[PDB]
Design a protein around this ligand. Structure first.
Ligand SMILES: CCOC(=O)[C@H](C)N(C(=O)c1cccs1)c1c(C)cccc1Cl
Length: 226
């Protein structure tokens, strides 16, 4: 891929992201003043773990579907064999969802957009896993400090997804190639926007992976229990 071919990769990634981002950034920013009251928060805390688990499962189900659609629009993701597509989505989809959260997150008051309004982690008290919820918020807090642009989120989420170290791939070398192409594409774009300094600030890959595994473990405790 030459100059025009790396810039085309950039833009196709930004395209998929734009067409699949679920919630527009301007809407999310405009809504930051729209915050759950004390009665509404208490209304959420009083709900059973089961109903709360139900609303979160639906939220996480809807968010994951847009991520699946993001994948399917990625130049070269289709060219991968169907088996490998599945291995990537299985291991990465929820990780991308975790990253995507930072846009719906207000570091000013440590709140997140949920079901029409902004609220803190104490919204989710009834689930009984604040340590995990607080990790997710902290993760989103430290990402929100980098002020990711829409494009950087596009490229970075592509790279969360396209990872050749996912256990059980069949065409591992072809997944490696695409990954290498996106890495360069991302690095180039950062150089054109004078944003290279974020690279040293990007979390250790094992942070996401570790947080997500902990998230899936609780999710499986939930799925079996209800
Ligand atoms: C493991 C069970 O706990 C959750 O489902 C929690 C409530 N939760 C999440 O797990 C999320 C994980 C990734 C994006 S949201 C979440 C939701 C659904 C909306 C807003 C903020 C968060 Cl942190």
């Amino acid at each position: 891929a030459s100059l025009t071919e790396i810039e085309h990769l950039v833009q196709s990634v930004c395209k998929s992201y734009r067409e699949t981002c679920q919630l527009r950034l301007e809407d999310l920013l405009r809504q930051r003043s729209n915050i759950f009251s004390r009665e509404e928060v208490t209304g959420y805390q009083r709900k059973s773990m089961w109903e709360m688990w139900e609303r979160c499962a639906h939220h996480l189900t809807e968010a994951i579907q847009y991520v699946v659609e993001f994948a399917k629009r990625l130049s070269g993701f289709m060219e991968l064999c169907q088996n490998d597509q599945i291995v990537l989505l299985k291991a990465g989809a929820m990780e991308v969802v975790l990253v995507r959260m930072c846009r719906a997150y207000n570091a000013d008051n440590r709140t997140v957009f949920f079901e029409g309004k902004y609220g803190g982690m104490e919204l989710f008290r009834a689930l009984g896993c604040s340590e995990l919820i607080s990790s997710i918020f902290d993760f989103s807090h430290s990402l929100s400090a980098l002020h990711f642009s829409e494009d950087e989120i596009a490229l970075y989420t592509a790279l969360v997804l396209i990872n050749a170290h996912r256990p059980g791939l069949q065409e591992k070398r072809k997944v490696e190639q695409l990954q290498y192409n996106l890495e360069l594409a991302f690095h180039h774009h950062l150089s054109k926007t004078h944003r290279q300094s974020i690279l040293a600030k990007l979390p250790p890959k094992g942070k996401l992976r570790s947080l997500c595994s902990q998230h899936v473990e609780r999710l499986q405790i939930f799925q079996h229990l209800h």
